[PDB]
Amino acid sequence: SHRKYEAPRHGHLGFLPRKRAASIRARVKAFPKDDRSKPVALTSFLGY
Amino acid sequence: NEQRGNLNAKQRALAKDLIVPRRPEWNEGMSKFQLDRQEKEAFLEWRRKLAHLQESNEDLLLTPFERNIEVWKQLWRVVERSDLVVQIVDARNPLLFRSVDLERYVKESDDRKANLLLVNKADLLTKKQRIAWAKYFISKNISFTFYSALRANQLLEVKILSIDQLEELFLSKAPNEPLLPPLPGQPPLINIGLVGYPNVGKSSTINSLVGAKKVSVSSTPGKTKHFQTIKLSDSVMLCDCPGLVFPNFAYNKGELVCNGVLPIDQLRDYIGPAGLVAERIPKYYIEAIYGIHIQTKSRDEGGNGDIPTAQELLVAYARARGYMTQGYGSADEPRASRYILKDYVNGKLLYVNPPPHLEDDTPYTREECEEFNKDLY
Amino acid sequence: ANISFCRNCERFLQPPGQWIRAELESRELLAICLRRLKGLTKVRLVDASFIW
């Protein structure tokens, strides 16, 4: 039988699993695209 | 009022069109349909003659009338076999229920066939008004016979017109006097024939005469209608038509359902008919019966007067005991409109009309208010 | 508009499926205004009394 009253899903499926992270310092999965005309500089920074 | 004097005189110039369907002559007419075809065209033309009234007058809005042809035939048989054609009128509006135009149809096959007007509940009116009532009936020269259907009356507290101002008893001596010989020779009993409107006691009266309840309340929808006769006297038979309504005239459309013309249990636009009960009663009279203490007339906040409105009566009567609406409570005016208009016709909210005269009607009408009550001291 | 009618048995068809047998020219004034497309949007259906 059908759902009888349509409604959107509760929650987001691209954020599974809800499991505890491996470390309190979260990793950076990806850095910006390299542009080798510009001078040398860093891409991120650590802080509290 | 200026509005009262003009709208009375407009009706008098148009009274001649109303007539009836009249049964044109049929001498032998042996027929499967040729008597029926002969009788259609009289009512079909009479239906057309009332249709021209709507173009002729503006805001003329007249009484409903029996548009069914078969109801009119039941009038035709009763007016034919009877030597006396009799009209029952209410006494609260004596001019309205009477039709003078039907009496023209009585004198057609006359051989001294007569007209009679018997008018009920005379004890309700007063002693003073019936003296003023007796002047108009003789001046148009038809009849006036008041009565009240009680075997023992309780009417506690110049001869010329005051001799018939007393109404009559329960006696049938007053129908016994007009016609002594019969119009057909062979039957020993004569007959009398009764014609009146529904919601006027043509069934309430002659229930009490025969005492066996043969006349009972109005007929079924699925039938033709009926026609019934009853024998009660040494020397008269009774006949009554199925109750129907004659097209005389109507004004303001509220007075119809305020009287017994239109049904109270079917009404739309209750503001008009509840407005007519408002001004035609004084304030402390309703305050004695129901005990409403209405006042609320805005009484030096918006205007000057002691007159009521259609709103503030229905609200205050139903701001008493209960009567609230769904969703939000705003006092439920239309439910209270039934119980006031039913007490108008039943006679708790009694009123007497001005007697008719050529154009004029008074602003200050005669009244009746008893100072005593079972609760008021 | 269009109003259906039993030629033999004198009935009136309501919009869904009904066959209300009404008295002719008395209360058909009351059975039509359901079938009419117009609803309660029109002001106050103050009066209605059909002509011949």
Added chain:
Amino acid sequence: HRGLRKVACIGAWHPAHVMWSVARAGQRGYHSRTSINHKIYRVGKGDDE
């Protein structure tokens, strides 16, 4: 009866398994998140009163 802060219907008869997309109680919080487009207003120095 026996609890109102729940989910009523976990699944249908067929398939005879609980799917991966239903809501089910467990750990909340302490996840790795990335939030983009935050605009810097002020970069203040250390030895600066």
Added chain:
Amino acid sequence: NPVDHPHGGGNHQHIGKASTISRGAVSGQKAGLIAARRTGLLR
């Protein structure tokens, strides 16, 4: 109930047969108007 009295039972409360009972019945039938030579309201 029908076991308790000969007027008992049924899907209404009615007796079912004539309540007037003959003089020459047995013990257990005589429950009702016994040997009624008349009944009803007197005239």
Added chain:
Amino acid sequence: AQGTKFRISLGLPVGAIMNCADNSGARNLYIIAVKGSGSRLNRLPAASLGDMVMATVKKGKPELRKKVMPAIVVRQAKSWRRRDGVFLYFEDNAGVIANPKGEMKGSAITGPVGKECADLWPRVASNSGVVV
């Protein structure tokens, strides 16, 4: 008909009975709908200060009663956040009745009028005495 308005806190669901600020005879208004409301299962659509609601008159003149007609909220009791910072709220709820264009049937308004209603609706600011 309704222009851009910054979101403020929804304080009037369906079934609310707000007052009637104008002088068109009506005493209070019964909210049955909000124009431009959303869609969510089991969710009552709610109004705000300056929304346009469909409403009926439960108390007042008998001519105005028993018909559904659009109305505009001019006061609100739930506190809302203005962008400049402050949280404010009136004492009671209020609404004025209108045609579906947005023009107003009454002549004047008693009591104060919220400022985000006077910017959005041109006719309400013409008839407003006190603007916050």
Added chain:
RNA sequence: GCAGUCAAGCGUUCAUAGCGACAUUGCUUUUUGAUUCUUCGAUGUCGGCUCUUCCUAUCAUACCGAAGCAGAAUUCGGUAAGCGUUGGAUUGUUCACCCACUAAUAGGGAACGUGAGCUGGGUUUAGACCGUCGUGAGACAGGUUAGUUUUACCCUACUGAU
């Protein structure tokens, strides 16, 4: 229930823009019948609430083709199920029917989804009144009232954790 073919004719003058008489070939298993194969040492037998997923025969949104498409508004068709598809009065209702908003309020499946998740209004125990039938016990799938809804600590599945 849905989709084709063939063309007499309607479409103010033209068979196929849109429609399609007389006939004819199919699909589908959300209707309802037919049959009695499986269960009577019991598969908890209506409806709603709650929640996930699937289908396309597409109501809305994306891009397109045709019109008797000037614009506006609309009707017919293609790819397309990625994403949305509601708030209320009445009834136990599924269904129905109105009022209102909306971009739009499309139709369906999963043991007629889902009762060791619920509620118990309804149906189908025992109490009781009414109506018609029965001489009578009683009958009615006719109407109205009152009526206990049991256990998971095992295994797998799933969600978190070693």
Added chain:
RNA sequence: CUCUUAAGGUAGCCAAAUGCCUCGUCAUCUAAUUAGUGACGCGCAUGAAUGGAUUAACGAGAUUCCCACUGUCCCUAUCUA
């Protein structure tokens, strides 16, 4: 006058706990009412101690509506044993 071996529903009452067709018909209440009330009665199959109709009071009885009130809900949150 008369057919069924008697008599032909009287006084009252109603879509009622009694009406199949049926969500009867017409008003009314509501933005909307298969519910509620007021009427109408050829009533499948109401009716006079198998008692009829009417009733102040009384009711852990059945039904509809309003005022006051509120996490029953919009829409969930928090604290204690």
Added chain:
RNA sequence: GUGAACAGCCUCUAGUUGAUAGAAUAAUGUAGAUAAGGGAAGUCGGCAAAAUAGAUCCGUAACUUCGGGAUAAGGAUUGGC
């Protein structure tokens, strides 16, 4: 002792201090609670909960078998010295 009260709450004489315990404060429960604005839209159904409550004074309708309805409704006041 408070109070109209042998009600509820706290004390004297008399009696007991027994009902498996320790450490933590996750969910879901059971028992007791609180809530912004709206106020029955929730639901078969105001089911559960909330609001009114003692006393003194004014004031009390329809209807009625004249006994009642009645604490009707509705509106003020309340400590200490």
